[PDB]
Structures are given as structure tokens and as C-alpha cells.
Amino acid sequence: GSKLMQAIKCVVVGDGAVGKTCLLISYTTNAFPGEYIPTVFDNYSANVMVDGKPVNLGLWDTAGQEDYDRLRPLSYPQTDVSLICFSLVSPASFENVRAKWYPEVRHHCPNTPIILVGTKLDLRDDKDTIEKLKEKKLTPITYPQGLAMAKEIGAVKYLECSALTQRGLKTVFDEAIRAVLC
Amino acid sequence: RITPKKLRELSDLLRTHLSSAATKQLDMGGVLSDLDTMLVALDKAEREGGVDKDQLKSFNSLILKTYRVIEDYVKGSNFMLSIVEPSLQRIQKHLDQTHSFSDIGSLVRAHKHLETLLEVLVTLSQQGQPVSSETYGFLNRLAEAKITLSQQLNTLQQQQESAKAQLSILINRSGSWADVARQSLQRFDSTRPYTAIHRQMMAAHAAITLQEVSEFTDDMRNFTVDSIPLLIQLGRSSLMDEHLVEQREKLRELTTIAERLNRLEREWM
Numbered sequence: 001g002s003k004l005m006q007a008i009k010c011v012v013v014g015d016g017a018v019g020k021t022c023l024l025i026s027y028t029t030n031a032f033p034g035e036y037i038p039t040v041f042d043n044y045s046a047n048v049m050v051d052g053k054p055v056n057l058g059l060w061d062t063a064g065q066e067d068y069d070r071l072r073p074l075s076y077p078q079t080d081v082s083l084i085c086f087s088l089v090s091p092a093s094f095e096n097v098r099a100k101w102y103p104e105v106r107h108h109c110p111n112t113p114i115i116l117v118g119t120k121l122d123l124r125d126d127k128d129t130i131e132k133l134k135e136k137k138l139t140p141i142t143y144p145q146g147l148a149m150a151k152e153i154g155a156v157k158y159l160e161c162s163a164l165t166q167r168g169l170k171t172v173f174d175e176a177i178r179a180v181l182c
Numbered sequence: 183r184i185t186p187k188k189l190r191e192l193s194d195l196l197r198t199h200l201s202s203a204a205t206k207q208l209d210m211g212g213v214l215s216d217l218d219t220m221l222v223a224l225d226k227a228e229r230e231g232g233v234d235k236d237q238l239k240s241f242n243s244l245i246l247k248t249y250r251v252i253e254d255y256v257k258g259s260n261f262m263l264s265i266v267e268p269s270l271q272r273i274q275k276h277l278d279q280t281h282s283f284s285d286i287g288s289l290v291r292a293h294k295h296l297e298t299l300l301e302v303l304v305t306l307s308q309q310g311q312p313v314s315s316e317t318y319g320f321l322n323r324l325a326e327a328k329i330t331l332s333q334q335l336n337t338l339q340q341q342q343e344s345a346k347a348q349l350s351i352l353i354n355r356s357g358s359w360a361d362v363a364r365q366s367l368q369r370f371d372s373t374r375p376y377t378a379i380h381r382q383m384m385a386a387h388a389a390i391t392l393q394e395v396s397e398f399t400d401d402m403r404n405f406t407v408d409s410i411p412l413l414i415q416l417g418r419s420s421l422m423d424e425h426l427v428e429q430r431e432k433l434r435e436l437t438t439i440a441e442r443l444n445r446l447e448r449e450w451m
């Protein structure tokens with residue numbers, strides 16, 4: 001016979017090259033891609049156990065660019081939760097959380113929970129990356145900094161993760177799910 | 183093979199869509215699927231003649247005129263994705279290929295086709311309920327194809343402009359000695375009858391000719407160094423900008439002059 005289960009829609013946004021597309025791949029295939037990385041991940045829906053009852057998790061990747069700006073809006077309808085991603089080693093991606101992504105989502109999805117995701121957690125303690133940024137008066141975003149951004153945009157949870165090491169990765173999606181079951 | 187008869191079979195087909203358009207009946211899956219056919223037909227025809235350049239142009243026109251009309255008609259369940267996807271997959275096989283300047287028009291047409299499926303499919307979306315994930319997934323695949331393709335097409339036209347440019351530097355420079363050299367060579371060719379002594383005589387004739395153009399010996403070495411590769415790149419195809427094959431053939435004539443004179447000594451002395 002059949003039984004019902006929860007089906008949840010999830011939409012990921014954020015500046016180009018913050019790691020959106022890799023996050024999704026690494027999570028759903030347990031493999032960070034070598035070369036070739038589509039702009040937007042093939043639309044794709046995952047069954048995840050949570051507290052003993054399975055849940056269907058529809059992952060909608062996005063981009064922005066120029067074709068991609070007419071496209072992104074079409075993902076928003078009926079969204080249950082949305083992740084706003086930015087790169088921990090790109091303060092400009094951080095600024096667009098307040099400036100761009102937060103307002104865009106609240107426009108299209110009033111009342112839907114938002115998680116803020118700081119990405120590329122592995123690169124924060126990488127001296128190559130840190131030196132490059134020192135070389136132009138920049139430094140990584142810290143936790144209390146991201147946590148405060150999350151507080152200010154009314155995000156339900158702030159989470160750091162690294163698609164490459166998978167370090168925070170599974171937590172991000174568990175919390176995304178959890179935020180929808182209240 | 184694409185014959186003329188086939189081509190007008192295909193043209194009467196488009197005209198049919200153009201009328202259904204005129205009277206608000208256009209089968210949009212019909213016309214998009216059929217257009218894909220036109221593109222492969224026109225592609226095949228372009229690269230084995232059999233069809234005269236008169237029709238090829240009017241067929242191209244008629245295609246574009248259909249695209250036109252589709253764009254104007256859009257302002258006023260996965261059904262489309264189902265019909266239109268084959269076209270994207272075929273066009274996707276062009277991207278992984280290697281391109282020459284004869285391919286320009288083919289790619290301009292493919293681009294217009296993706297441009298058009300995109301505008302049509304986003305329009306049906308922006309109004310027709312939320313979009314399915316299959317269609318969203320297609321849409322993005324379309325946008326990635328269109329931008330990769332724009333990037334190659336721009337590389338190709340950018341490269342061609344610089345061949346046009348190189349061509350006319352070399353044509354302009356040649357002509358310091360085009361004149362002297364052509365005429366020298368004409369005199370040399372017109373006079374030439376074996377034995378020891380015949381060999382000395384032909385040697386002498388060549389030495390005279392080399393002298394006549396001795397002010398350019400150097401220039402003509404350097405010219406063929408510059409111009410032979412350009413000619414290999416531009417190749418011998420009938421299918422490119424008309425002015426460009428003109429300039430191209432002008433450069434081949436110039437190059438055969440220099441190359442004769444650059445060879446003359448090791449050939450006859």
C-alpha cells in the first residue's frame with residue numbers, strides 16, 4: 001500500500017562562486033566535484049530520515065548572471081525553506097546577504113524560514129587564502145559576524161560548512177528540514 | 183541529400199505556421215520542432231551546394247521571419263520540455279566541436295533557436311503556475327547552452343575580424359613590390375628553352391630576374407613567412423564572407439609571386 005510522507009522544497013541562493021552548486025553535489029553524492037561544475041545543479045530530490053520518519057527534500061539550485069536573473073524567480077513559488085549562502089572568504093558575498101538576497105527572498109517568500117549558510121569553512125584557516133586577502137585589506141568572516149548577520153536578517157539558524165570536507169554539510173540540510181516541521 | 187524540392191517542401195511547411203500565426207492558431211510545439219528540422223536541412227544544404235545561393239538566402243530569411251513572428255506571438259504538465267528537448271541535445275553536440283569561419287552562420291542560427299526556446303518557455307512559465315522541476319532543470323540547461331554558444335561565436339567572429347585585418351595589412355604592404363615582381367616574373371616565364379651550357383644560360387636568366395627585384399628579396403622572404411600561415415588558416419572554402427574570400431584570393435596570388443622569386447635561385451642556379 002502507500003503512506004504519506006513530508007515533501008519539502010528547498011531553494012539555495014547567493015552570489016556566484018560562493019559554493020552553492022558544490023554544496024548540493026557534495027551533499028547528495030558525497031563527492032566534491034573535480035573539474036566541471038555546472039552553473040546550476042540538476043534539479044533533484046532527496047529522501048532523508050529525520051527522527052525516524054522519512055522526508056522528501058527537493059533541492060533547487062540557482063544562479064544569477066543575465067539569463068539566470070529571469071530564471072531564479074521561477075524557483076521561489078511554494079518554497080518551504082531557503083538557504084542564503086555566502087563565502088566565508090569573500091566579504092562582498094557577505095555584504096550581498098543584506099543588500100540583495102535577504103530582500104529578494106522576503107519579497108518572493110514572505111513567511112518562509114531562512115537559514116544563513118557561510119560556505120568554504122575549510123579555507124578560513126588556509127594561509128594561502130588568508131595571505132591573498134591580506135594582500136588587499138580583507139579577512140574572512142567570523143562566526144560572531146555571520147551570527148549577527150543572521151540575527152539581523154531574521155534567519156532561523158546560521159550555519160558554517162565546507163562542501164570540500166563535508167564538515168558542516170549534513171547539518172545544514174537537517175536544520176533546513178527541521179525549520180519546516182516548525 | 184538536400185535537394186531544392188526538399189527545401190520548398192520545408193518552406194511550404196513554415197508558411198503554414200506563419201498563417202496559423204496570422205489567425206491565432208499557431209501550434210507552438212509544432213513550429214519549434216519543425217524549426218529544428220529546418221536548421222539541420224539548411225546546414226546540410228550549405229555544405230554540399232546542390233542548392234543555389236538564391237534559395238539558401240530566402241530560406242534563411244524565411245526561418246528568421248518565423249522566429250520573428252514567434253517572438254511577437256508570445257506576448258499573446260511538462261508538455262513543451264517533452265517536444266523541444268531533442269533540439270537542445272542536438273545543438274549541445276555543436277559545443278564540444280571545433281569550429282571554422284564557415285560555421286559562423288550555423289551557430290548564429292542555433293543561438294537564435296535557443297534564444298527562442300528560452301523566451302518562449304519562460305513566458306509560458308511566468309504565468310502558468312509554478313514551474314516543474316524538470317522544466318526548471320531544462321531551462322537552466324538551455325541558458326548554459328546559450329551562453330557557452332555566445333562565447334564560442336564571439337570567439338569565432340573576433341578571430342575572423344583579425345584575419346580580415348591581417349589580410350589587408352599584408353595586401354597593403356605587398357604592393358611596394360607586387361608590380362615590379364609580377365612583371366619580372368612575366369619576363370622570366372616568357373623566355374626559357376639539356377646540356378651544360380643550357381644550364382648556365384637559364385642560371386643567367388634567373389640571376390637577371392633576381393637582380394631586377396633585389397630591392398625586395400628581403401621583403402618577399404618576410405611576406406611568405408607571414409602570409410603562408412594565414413592562408414592555411416583561411417583555407418580554400420567557398421563559404422565565408424564574400425569580401426574575405428576576395429582578399430584571400432588576392433593574397434594567394436601575391437604569395438605565389440614571392441614564393442616563386444624566393445625559390446628562383448635554388449631552382450635554376
Ligand SMILES: Nc1nc2c(ncn2[C@@H]2O[C@H](COP(=O)(O)OP(=O)(O)O)[C@@H](O)[C@H]2O)c(=O)[nH]1
Nearest residue numbers: 015016017018019020021022037120162163164
Ligand atoms: N576550497 C573550497 N572551494 C569550494 C568549496 N565549495 C565550492 N568551492 C569552489 O568555488 C568555486 C565555485 O563553486 P560553485 O559551487 O559552482 O559556485 P556557485 O556559483 O555559487 O555555485 C569552484 O571553483 C569550487 O571548486 C569549498 O567548500 N571549499
Ligand SMILES: [Mg+2]
Nearest residue numbers: 021038039040
Ligand atoms: Mg553555480
